[PDB]
Every structure is written in structure tokens, then in C-alpha cells.
From Swiss-Prot, chains A, B:
Residues 297-344 are annotated as: GPS. Residues 221-344 form the GAIN-B domain. This is Adhesion G protein-coupled receptor B2. Heterodimer of 2 chains generated by proteolytic processing; the large extracellular N-terminal fragment and the membrane-bound C-terminal fragment predominantly remain associated and non-covalently linked. Interacts with GABPB2. Interacts (via carboxy-terminus) with TAX1BP3. Interacts with GNAZ. Interacts with SH3GL2. Orphan G-protein coupled receptor involved in cell adhesion and probably in cell-cell interactions. Activates NFAT-signaling pathway, a transcription factor, via the G-protein GNAZ. Involved in angiogenesis inhibition. Changing W312S: Inhibits autoproteolytic cleavage. Belongs to the G-protein coupled receptor 2 family. Adhesion G-protein coupled receptor (ADGR) subfamily. It comes from Homo sapiens.
């Protein structure tokens, strides 16, 4: 059977035979290519899949990239303005799946220029960087990332610029100084400690601090990181912890029976640490959906080249009590942590 | 213990008991009063402090004031000649601490007469005004200002006539026109923009312009003033930026641990601006001395009545990277900016 000619999102999709991909130029909003696949169900009936705009980039986002390029050849002040623009641009919900992938690139350029120019972002710059991130990973865009990641591992890439930005910020803090950044979909703590006199255990997130969003306060997620873990494998440890509310929905998934059903915690430390062989990291993580079963604590390294495969690691962590909408994990090496489970 | 009779600078200082001030008539050069304090060290030994000539005014400077007064009761041409005379007089290094304080008054009379008579100073008049200023604030006179400012806030007063003179000049420029004035100890930019169509961001100082002194070219000080800041709280903005090389040595100091260790940038704008709540002003400032620590960016309002107190403001500005003999600041409201630090 065949999918018939449709008009959708200002584009005509010519009749197509089951199993072939049709391509069209992106809407005049943008440039690139759009695609739609003529699928065949089980009963033998052909039906149109959804159209993909992963390779479409709104002119607005291209213009913002070119300005970014103007500033590079005062650079820092330029990147401050790029992120101001990007956030304003994203808030308008005028972007295709491919504009998200292009935003990750812009954030990398911004983050790489800040490091290259030794330009410490302002306080409002940090908050705005992570508010951009919060927009991008909002569940509202769960289907756009599903479409974006068929062409490029946008989440692997985003977590890596986030890691670079965290340590750009943390590298400017004073010894024993910390900072908290709260957004709709992330909470971030950046902490700096001397390698030879790490002051205390690291816990996170500190709910007592007024400013903490509700979804964290009325929650059970927490990190306990014993100071005994912060040991060397430059003169300061930058410790960053990120609790993503929704990121689990778009990460490389685990083997089929299971699924990322929890909030996600990243714990990055530079320089590299030699963790003890005993699992000494406590990671408690709330669930994204009521009704799960068979929890498996896991860690997943977005730094590896095969990061997009989704090789989750269930031997790093030990799964302990599951209760009150969360599960506790006891993990050995630092990484990105989640509770894999069978969804309803 | 007592300080014994000394003869110094053509004056006899009678024996004095520790802690009392002795007074003498000024040298015959001048009129007024000189003073010297019999101090007591920690060990209990009395010793003469230095003599103060803050209240002495050389006859030469009094004669120049009386001529100033002749011209006022053709006035403008008179004030042109006063500044010609003052500069010639200052260049001769024949002045007491009190002649400096008297020069500030003369510059106010000159500046007030120019405004009162709507007499736009010539190009050579502007340059000569600021060359007078450069002489006066040269570090050579760092001890004279220390002596002058025990009786009158000469620097608060000088910065205010400078502000009045800048806006007298700037009020005569054409729209979008600018001017640069370079001296040994200051660099001044005066810029005029329409309130409703401010053309671009203001940066300063533009080192590319040949004519720029060396101490600025081989330096890192800079202002970035986004056009977004120039918003109203008459039909034109006069924007003046002054980078003082040495002024930090004689401004009201901060709390004891810290000290004005940097070059100083004033940024005046008339009419008054309503700045955004986000800190959008970038101020980079070089250090006056190698060896500082613990930098704190600060702003200080010489317009307030308590200006002489030295209420520096460290919440206006955010201190960012410190590197290559300067420190970057990100400030919210326009003012006079410096980097306070612990000196060696
Ligand atoms: C921006 O980042 C992208 C992706 O990381 C890279 O391909 C591109 O070369 C960068 N552009 C600039 C101007 O640095
Ligand atoms: C000159 O200025 C001084 C100080 O501002 C003031 O006291 C004096 O009255 C002025 N003299 C004239 C003639 O305007
Ligand atoms: C520094 As990491 C979170 O990639 O182990
Ligand atoms: C016009 As101003 C330098 O006193 O803020």
C-alpha cells in the first residue's frame, strides 16, 4: 500500500510507496531538508509517519550564528549577547528540531570562546546559560529531540558543553566557595575545593537554601559524596552536580525491558579522581512516572565516543531501598546516574 | 617628650610638646598659615611631623585670581587667558599644597563663567584645561594632596569641575561627534548622541587612534558601555569617559585592608540615565603597583555630599578575571570605578 499526497506544515508530501523516505526543502522559515517516511503497519496498511525537521535551521538561528562569528574576528561581551539572543529566540517557540541541534553548537562556541578568551561569564550570564539549557531539555521538546537525535546525538553534545561551562565557572570561584543555579528543569551546584585539603563531604541539593525550586524541595533526590572520593589519579577540585528533572526522556535508552524512569544526576569532578574500590557515593533519585517496577541503578558516561550507544553500567551502582517515589543507589565511580526500570 | 626648635623651609618651628600643633605665617612667597604637629611615636619619643602648607596661597596665584575677577566685571577671552596663566604658573613648580586647592577654585570659576556666558572653549582651551588637571593630579603632588585634603576635599571638588567642563564641551559637539584629549595622567573622551537614536555601543579608550599616549596603548583599561544603558529616568546624551592614570593615589580611601590600587575610570552621562537592573557595563582597569591581592571592584560617587567619606560601593560591580596586570569588572550603574585591593 502507499501513502497518499498530504499537505502538512505548509508542505506537500507527494504520494510515496511504503518504506521510502520523501524529502522536501525546509519551510521558508528555514533552510535545509525535511523528511517524512511512508510506513507500513502490521496489518499491511501503509501510513505516513511524522515529518522530521532535524535538518532545518530557522533563518533566525543562522543570523544569530553569523553574529557570533562577527564577534570572534570584546569577544566575551559578544558571547554574552549571543546567549541573551538565543534565550529570547528560544522563548518564542519558533524552532524546529534542527534549531535545537544548532543551539547546542552555539552554546559550544560560546563556551569555547569564554575559555579561549579567559572571559569569566557574569552572574547573569551563568543563569542565562542554564536557563537556555532548561528550555531546550523541557519535556515540551521531547518529540523534537526524538527527531533531532536520529541525525546527531544532541544530548551527548549538550551534556558536554554543560560540563565545559560548569568547570569554566567553577574555575573562577574562591577556595571553599559554592554556587547554586535553579531553573525549571535543572538544579546546578558548582563547588571548588583544594585538592590537598578538601573541606567536607559534598551533599546536594541543599533544599534549605531559599531559592530552591519546588520540584526539588518537595522531592527526595540527593547526592552524598564523601570527601574520601576526592583523591587524585590542577591544585583545586571543581565539583559540579546537576539534577535534571526531565533529561531522562531523551538520553540513549537502556536495553528494551528497562527504561530511564527517573530524574538524572550528573556529578563531574576535575581533575580526574581515583575513587575508592568500595562504593561510597550515595545517589537517591525520584521517578518520572508512577507505576514502575524492577529498578536498576545505572551510570552512563557521556564522555565516551560510543556515548550515543547508551551503554548503561549497572555494576557501578548497587540498588537499595525503593520507597516513597524514589530509589536509593550506592555507586563507585562518578558519572551520570539514573534508575532504570520497567515502565507501566 | 618634646619636639625641639627646628628651622625648615625658611621657617622656625618653636619647641613644642608632643601632640600640639604649632602655627606660623606662610613663607613670604605666600599668605595664610602653615602648621606642623609635634608627634609621639610608639616608643614614647616625640618627633616632628611634616609641615603643612595647605592654607598657604602663593601671591602669584592670588594675583591670577584677582585678574580672573577683573574679567568678570570679553569675559570668555579672559578665562582663556587665566588657564594659559595657571598652566604656565603650575609648570614652574612654585606652589604649596594650598595653591593646588586654590587652582581647583580657579578652574571652577573658569568653568562656571564659560557656562554662564555660553562661551564654548576653543580646541586649545580644552586641551589646556585638562593639561592643567594632569599637572595637578600628577603623582609628584601625591604628598601635597595628602596635605591639602586634611582641610578640604580637593579631589571631590576637582572631579566635579572636570564633570562640568566635560559637559560644557560635549554640549557643543555635533550629533554623533566625539573628541579625544590625551595628557600625561588622563585620557578623556567626550561623545554626543541623540537620546532617541543612540547610534552604537560606547567603547573607550580607542587605542587605534594615533595620538593615544603610550601608558594607554600598552595597557588593558577599557570601557564597554552598551547602548542599552543610555535610557532616560536634554534631547542629547553627552557621554564623558575619563581614565586617570594616577588619581587613585589621592581619592578617599576604602576600608583599611583594601586600597585603591588601580587606574580610575569616570563615566558621566547627562541627562541622568535609568540603567538596566542587569549589570551591563564592562570596566577593565590596570593596577598601579605589582603585588596586590584580593581585588574588589568598586564604584564611588563624587557627587554626593558625603563624597569625602569614601563610601565605595562593591555591590554595584562584580569582580571577574584578574590577569595580566589588570582586573575586569561588570558594573550596573555609571560612576567612578576602581579596583580595590590589598597592597603589598
Ligand atoms: C561552533 O561549534 C560547532 C560545533 O561544535 C563547530 O562545528 C563550529 O566550527 C564552531 N564555530 C566556530 C565559529 O567556532
Ligand atoms: C570661584 O570659585 C570659588 C570656589 O568654587 C567660589 O568660592 C568663589 O566665589 C568663585 N569666585 C568668583 C569670582 O566667582
Ligand atoms: C567528569 As564525568 C561526569 O564525565 O565522570
Ligand atoms: C554623571 As556621574 C559620573 O556623577 O554618575
Amino acid at each position: 500500500e502507499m501513502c497518499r499526497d498530504e499537505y502538512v506544515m505548509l508542505m506537500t508530501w507527494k504520494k510515496a510507496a511504503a518504506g521510502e523516505i520523501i524529502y522536501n526543502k525546509c519551510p521558508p522559515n528555514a533552510s535545509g531538508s525535511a523528511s517524512r517516511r511512508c510506513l507500513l503497519s502490521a496489518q499491511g496498511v501503509a501510513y505516513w509517519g511524522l515529518p522530521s525537521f532535524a535538518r532545518c535551521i530557522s533563518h533566525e538561528y543562522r543570523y544569530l550564528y553569523l553574529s557570533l562569528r562577527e564577534h570572534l574576528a570584546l569577544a566575551g561581551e559578544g558571547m554574552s549577547q549571543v546567549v541573551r539572543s538565543l534565550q529570547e529566540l528560544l522563548a518564542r517557540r519558533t524552532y524546529y528540531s534542527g534549531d535545537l541541534l544548532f543551539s547546542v553548537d552555539i552554546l559550544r562556541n560560546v563556551t569555547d570562546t569564554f575559555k579561549r578568551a579567559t572571559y569569566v561569564p557574569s552572574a547573569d550570564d551563568v543563569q542565562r546559560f542554564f536557563q537556555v539549557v532548561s528550555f531546550m531539555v523541557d519535556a515540551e521538546n521531547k518529540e523534537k529531540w526524538d527527531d533531532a537525535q536520529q541525525v546527531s546525538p544532541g544530548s551527548v553534545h549538550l551534556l558536554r558543553v554543560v560540563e565545559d561551562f560548569i568547570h569554566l565557572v567553577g574555575d573562577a570561584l574562591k577556595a571553599f566557595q559554592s554556587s547554586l543555579i535553579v531553573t525549571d528543569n535543572l538544579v546546578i551546584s558548582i563547588q571548588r575545593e583544594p585538592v590537598s585539603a578538601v573541606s567536607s563531604d559534598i551533599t546536594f541539593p541543599m533544599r534549605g537554601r531559599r531559592g530552591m525550586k519546588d520540584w526539588v524541595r518537595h522531592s527526595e533526590d540527593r547526592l552524598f559524596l564523601p570527601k574520601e572520593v576526592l583523591s587524585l589519579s590542577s591544585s583545586y577540585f571543581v565539583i559540579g552536580a546537576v539534577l535534571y528533572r526531565t533529561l531522562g526522556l531523551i538520553l540513549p535508552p537502556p536495553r528494551p525491558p528497562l527504561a530511564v524512569t527517573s530524574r538524572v544526576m550528573t556529578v563531574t569532578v576535575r581533575p580526574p579522581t581515583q575513587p575508592p574500590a568500595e562504593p561510597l557515593i550515595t545517589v537517591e533519585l525520584s521517578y518520572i512516572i508512577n507505576g514502575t517496577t524492577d529498578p536498576h541503578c545505572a551510570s552512563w558516561d557521556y564522555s565516551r565516543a560510543d556515548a550515543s550507544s547508551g551503554d548503561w553500567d549497572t555494576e557501578n551502582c548497587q540498588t537499595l531501598e525503593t520507597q516513597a517515589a524514589h530509589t536509593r543507589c550506592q555507586c563507585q565511580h562518578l558519572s551520570t546516574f539514573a534508575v532504570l526500570a520497567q515502565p507501566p
